[PDB]
Design a protein around this ligand. Sequence first.
Ligand SMILES: *[C@@H](C(=O)O)[C@H](O)C(=O)N[C@@H](CC(C)C)C(=O)NCCCCNC(N)=[NH2+]
Length: 254
Amino acid sequence: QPVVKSLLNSKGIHYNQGNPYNLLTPVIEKVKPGEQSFVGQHAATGCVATATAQIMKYHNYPNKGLKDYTYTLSSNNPYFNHPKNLFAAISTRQYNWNNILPTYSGRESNVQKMAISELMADVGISVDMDYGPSSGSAGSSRVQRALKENFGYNQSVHQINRSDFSKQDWEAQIDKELSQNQPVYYQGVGKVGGHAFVIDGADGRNFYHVNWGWGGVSDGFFRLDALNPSALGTGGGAGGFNGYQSAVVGIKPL
Ligand SMILES: *[C@@H](C(=O)O)[C@H](O)C(=O)N[C@@H](CC(C)C)C(=O)NCCCCNC(N)=[NH2+]
């Protein structure tokens, strides 16, 4: 396994799912019965959107979006009145990568905050995000399609599933991406829920660097069969994203 220093840390890239990343997600409309109110707050960007946007900022690409996207929320979502249709005019976008900064600490201009919030909202719409105080998407299968069809990435983009490969062949694909300076979108599920994140480095001892999409919290080196950040879990136990894993690889511009 070659040593590859964290590609996202090397470029300063640290996004998360709350403000000022979520300034253009839908505003929550209803209180879910039994829950405290989030009415009038913007929804979370979604882990799937935050992982994808960090990889897109690594490339500063595309300069122009390619194709619009429209979808309708599930009628089971208790945070919105129904029907609720969402639309992003991606085909008209000119993304200014000098305003979509690598990270935000609050002192940035409204233009800079809106620029990352527009990317996040466009990416989450393109993956059919189920918006809420937490926001969820199917992930990989939607991400690979959106990067090519809506954002003009190369036909090399594709999903790979962990169950289709030996451990050696799975890690060899990850290593090859990293050797080509290509961060990898990754997700999995387990006893502290499901999450999407970015693999962007390797230490030579079969651990990989992970950026979890929480602003920096828990980022570090993990085995791909023990993707277990300590920021999650209540009560003192174990858990991580070790089941039903998939990745999107080949992520580079046309
Ligand atoms: C992850 C996060 O914000 O931490 C976020 O919960 C998420 O996207 N979870 C996914 C599963 C992971 C990507 C492994 C999820 O919600 N899966 C279920 C389907 C979600 C809703 N999608 C549609 N189209 N209704």
